[PDB]
Symmetry: D2
Subunit: 461 residues, 4 copies
């Protein structure tokens, strides 16, 4: 009589299991590790608190971790990102999961606490898998005693890594972490190509708007901005790119984009006078990709072309000043995760008003909120890295080391390039690709082993 879960509808489990079986065939690197390490059971004794979007893809990751011996308790890291049939299949497998699509903020926090607490007391957790740092934060701030037993954190995404490095710099990080984001088979796969697949996917599902011929402004040109700009350009949008980093802006120019600023001469002085109103009045779609705060601000929202679509694909919703819009403008729900924001005022709207914006997923990550996030064959790389990272920190056994050895190992590290390459090779074979083997003379000529690693650690790909 398994009841240790909370999902929208347990009766979706059979559907979710059908999609898990399909997803498994799309995830050869992750399923390869499941088959490789099953005999060793390297996560026997691991008790993992997991906080990451409860999608079908996350389901294959969860069941891999359990297949290698772990126990887990799971929650989503976003109120809109859960696929309810994925959550139901995991719960019907007997795995504690607290997640549904459309949580309130209070339900979101309740779901994390349900993973942390078992029977009203702290679970004897000893591993953390996090995506964005919310679970990491709650443990350090509200359950610090639990971190005495925890061997490490494996952190999925750019924003969570930044938070770990701030903690490390300030002396507040209590356990070591692996930066999963910066494996090449994560950052330069998931963050870029994942958003290429899923950004225009979510815009179409949300609005069914034609994108070809229309004007877009992408704020940011890091890995997510690069993939997002391509998602839109390959549909035929005229894409303009904003950046604060001149190296990233240089890449945008060379990639064929006009680089512009929302602010005259790029100077954001906080006044309406600084807004390039002519530019913003021609933009049909703005997408924020930065991991920064208030990059689509109130004065920008006032100046945007009527009926423009606004969305965010960075981790947190504060990229767009949705607070200003809740305070001043009237919200008309079109359907779940799609709202018309009427700039005519706060108290009610005319149903035929033409002066509105369309906001997707209330400013939360739009690929997961309005579609299904990245596809399985892309998440394969990210999640193979997660598994390898969990194995590595669980085996290092930090929670048991003497203090001097803790000092040497309290760090945020990445996986070695050899492993990054082994993940990539399984991905390539999933496409039917054939990697050539160096001859001994050729390996000697460029100074590498025939087996790799093939590049110095400085190499940027």
């Amino acid at each position: 009589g398994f009841t240790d879960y909370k999902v929208a509808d347990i009766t979706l489990a059979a559907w979710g299991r059908r999609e898990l079986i399909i997803a498994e065939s799309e995830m050869p690197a992750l399923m390869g590790l499941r088959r490789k390490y099953a005999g060793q059971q390297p996560l026997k004794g691991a008790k993992i608190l997991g906080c990451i979007h409860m999608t079908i893809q996350t389901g294959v990751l969860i069941e891999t971790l359990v297949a290698l011996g772990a126990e887990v308790r799971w929650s989503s890291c976003n109120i809109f990102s859960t696929q309810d049939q994925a959550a139901a299949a995991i719960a019907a497998a007997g795995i504690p999961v607290f997640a549904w699509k459309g949580e309130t903020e209070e339900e979101y926090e309740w779901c994390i606490e349900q993973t942390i607490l078992k029977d009203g007391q702290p679970w004897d957790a000893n591993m953390v898998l996090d995506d964005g740092g919310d679970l990491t934060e709650i443990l350090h701030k509200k359950y610090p005693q639990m971190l005495e037993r925890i061997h490490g954190i494996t952190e999925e995404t750019t924003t969570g890594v930044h938070r770990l490095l701030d903690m490390l710099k300030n002396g507040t990080l209590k356990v070591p972490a692996i930066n999963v984001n910066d494996s090449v088979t994560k950052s330069k796969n998931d963050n870029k190509y994942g958003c290429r697949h899923s950004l225009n996917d979510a815009i179409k599902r949300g609005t069914d708007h034609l994108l070809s011929g229309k004007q877009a402004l992408v704020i940011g040109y890091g890995d997510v901005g690069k993939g997002s700009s391509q998602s839109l350009r390959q549909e035929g949008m005229i894409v303009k790119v904003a950046e604060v980093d001149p190296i990233c802006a240089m890449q945008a120019c060379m990639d064929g984009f006009e680089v512009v600023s929302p602010y005259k001469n790029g100077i954001n002085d906080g006044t309406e006078a600084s807004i390039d109103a002519a530019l913003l009045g021609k933009i049909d779609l703005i997408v924020t990709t930065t991991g920064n705060v208030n990059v689509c601000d109130a004065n920008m929202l006032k100046a945007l072309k009527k009926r423009a679509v606004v969305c965010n694909i960075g981790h947190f919703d504060n990229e767009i000043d949705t607070a200003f819009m809740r305070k001043n403008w009237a919200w008309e729900e079109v359907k779940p995760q799609v709202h018309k924001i009427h700039r005519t005022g706060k108290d009610g709207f005319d149903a035929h008003n033409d002066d509105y914006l369309i906001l997707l997923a209330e400013g939360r990550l739009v690929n997961l909120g309005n579609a299904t996030g990245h596809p399985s064959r892309i998440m394969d790389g990210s999640f193979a890295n997660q598994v390898l990272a969990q194995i590595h920190l669980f085996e290092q056994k930090y929670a048991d080391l003497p203090a001097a050895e803790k000092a040497k190992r309290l760090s945020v590290e990445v996986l070695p390039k050899k492993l990054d390459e082994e993940v990539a090779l399984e991905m390539v074979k999933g496409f039917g690709g054939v990697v050539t083997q160096l001859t001994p003379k050729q390996a000697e000529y460029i100074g590498v082993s025939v087996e790799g690693p093939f590049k110095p650690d400085t190499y940027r790909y």
Copy 2:
């Protein structure tokens, strides 16, 4: 007035070269901004720079920037086919020693480098080296080691040259420090990739005027050059397949929409004709090597290629293709300079209407420079702004003046700091009319950077 200390193809091309320099200067804002920023300070006064890099119009703007900052130079090309003769002539007419022409022999190539090293029959009192590929660096270490005692540093342009510096550093044979100019992002991820995107299809059209759309290409390699090369051909409508030994680069090729294949069955190169994927190579209209490695388009691949396929190399050296095999066994018919039909029917003569030939560009030497003009000015702007900054830095550090114990602590291969890489990029972006946004103080604090940058940790890969 009596300047004779040069050797070029035709000095009367100087006026033409000067017109093209004046145009190129307006395409190179980072480099020309360095010229303006530092001219009064003369930070290279006293520098005596041996330069070895493709004697193009773009290199001319680099040379005159070094001279305008106070340096003296003596120059040669780093490839027998890459000089633009009008550029070398303009530089010579300006009274600057340059020894370079398009279509040098190997003996003339080595003579030209030695003319930069020697002045009036004796070693020039050089104290700086600017190199592209490592040949000048090698000749100095092997043949003129005494000159290195006075040299403060090497600024090395390209991936292959950096590899050779790092081999010397690990072997204990590198005598002076170096800056790896290649690995600035405004070099590696500008020049190596987008430069080849611009100039590869350029050189193939100039050499052959072949339609590329609808035809099959095989690109060997998918590093920065292979990425840019693959894009050069795909954007023309070619059906491009990619080979790689690096699974991470192979993963990128898959995700970028290319089929990843090996010339060898199951990727295993046992040296026999039997290991060749004859069915694959029999379909390929164009093969491009981009690896920096040896014999990646080998004799058995060449025998298996589709009749009338084009063969070329855009890596730094011609040993990527087994051209020696083709010289030894097959008859060469010159179509026009840097374009040869190689007839696979035998060595002693050929039927003029023979159908079983390959077209080789630039005799397997770097094809974008041999058959066209290499990277365009606005891309080389980034590379050469980095070169000027690197020259300034190593010259000001004065390594050659240190005691032996301190030289040992300073001997290293380094990259320029990120802040400079960003400053080059900013001038490039302004040259496109791009407008970079400035962080507010709260935004800078939120992501943990200074408002002025650097904006990324040194681990960032872009």
Copy 3:
């Protein structure tokens, strides 16, 4: 509310449908411009239109435009899977007879068309037909021929429908004139191509959430739908191969950068398993049929496809794929609505973990409408502005009231004049914020056109 003359899935979706209609109106400036232009004149006053076309949000705006101009209508969908239930509910809640829901059986499909034809058990006094594929046209000619005595014209949306009309005209069996709406440039080269570009990869993602980049696709056909479908996949990074019987379309595929292949050895489809290029089909991850032809993805191709390939059809009718063979021999496993795994291990039951299956989308029916929402409003604007102009033209001509000799001269299948095609395009361009330049008198005289257009001869192909 008193009004019961409809049948939809759920009338309570009406308000949601109305919200989407108000958005779609802002995406359809040509259609809303016609509403405002002709509202006062009521040119369709007295028209009674039988309509049979995908009951989507876009069709809703079309319906309410005909009504706003004076017409009465009775509506059904031309496909069992293409209805958007909230669009049908909005139309029914506006008082408009509509019989349509997503997921009809075949018997229910036929019944819905008959409910538009009949009002209270007797033929409605229809006088106009709007059709998409020819099913309603066929039912009237076969089963209700008396009704055609009062009907002034048919306006036919799509290529397959027009083919059927032209065969009836040749055979002397077409009883009323038609307008070929499909062959307006703002329909054929807008809807058929760019609509499939937008909506094909859209439906595949919704149905399977598969990564497309780096995978192998085979598009059967390279007409307008095959062009837009091939681009839909290639822009995602698929490696796309194209099959054609028309060498001119195959030439376009080559120049567009696709490899042109046949599923049969040497292109010869003799019906044997030996004729199948099994090596080619064993590498294909996705096959899309775009032909309007029969059995272009046949039993032997289905047998030979790579395990776990996706199979779909974006032509009008589901017989492009041999789904009947799959129904007879293989076990179907529903993943979710309009997504089935087809287990090639046999008919009775399946292993839930079997690896040898295909994924079929929308049971072989038009996949963009079955698994997503079809073309976007801004593209359908062009098709449906043409539909409204075509309805106005044939209604005002009053074919059914003309003397016999006048009928004989007007019994034809025609396209709208090019001047109207241009006026639709102009509104579409303005909807993008584009600005069309006006010729000077001298420039107009020089190319031999009016400043107002038409700008091209009728022979022009764009």
Copy 4:
């Protein structure tokens, strides 16, 4: 002792022969016609006046006509389009050719005259092959008696067809014509993909400018403007498109381009005030593609960004107001067919002036002027049509008809679709493409023969 020619340098003939031998391997449709018709000699007795760019590809066309039985006398239809090695190879084969790169207007007219006159008297020509209509006009106006002997004209390009249709309208056309341009294997191959290949080719050879990241304005979006826009966009330019035809403008929007006018509201009233100076002041490259007059006018040239490149790929050099620039601005030759135009005045220039434009090929066809025009494998389709059109008209012997039968036969027609498909099939085989054969049931289902034509004549591809 053959002397009946004039070329730049006859010693270039061996080079030209080498490139002809290579080009033949790139032109399977044209070489296929040599084999299919050699035995029958369909052009035995044809005497063809030919006027078209004397390129390597034209050399293969010429020698195909001769191999099928024709005699010819040849000139180029543009002063800059000749490849001198090609003209030399043709002269050395004993074929009268009068053409070199860099003719004056006087030499251009003289070269056409030498094809018309053999030994000071009109040659007994009975066939005409033209590209642009200059030879056709000269014969109608200056030697009308020779048209009593001529069976027809086969006209290569859109501008030339327009000029023929003016005469058919006015009743002043003396012989029938084949509109070769409007074969699909010409118009939608040569005019579009040909310019795709050769526009960015000529711009690189002429300027070596980076195109990625820069702003282009393409005037026109017919077949040449479509291919031109793609030539630039695929290099990473940000391309804007002007059109007067709203259908063509619709296609540009859908193809992912911003459609703009050089003039406010699109109204070309001839004033400086009409110019959108903000737009023109951002454009790095303008390309005219219209076949119309003065579509890049004096006020657009005055407003263009400093150092922008200006070129024309339409047939005639009056698309750009070069006359205005010759009268008012100082011209500095960079190298052959590349000039800087200094907007500081006419009385000389400062060698370091920054306020100049770069004009390519003096406003003449830039792909042939600064590069080599379309590649062999594209020109294969166009020229296979030219050969079939010459046979199609020669075998009909219009000049032998009585006046009443001539009237009935007098027309400007395209080749039937069956020939168009025959050319396309040979093109497809040259790529190694495999066309599928319809089954009888399938052919019956769509109402075509298994042997084609597969499309009604109304079809637009």
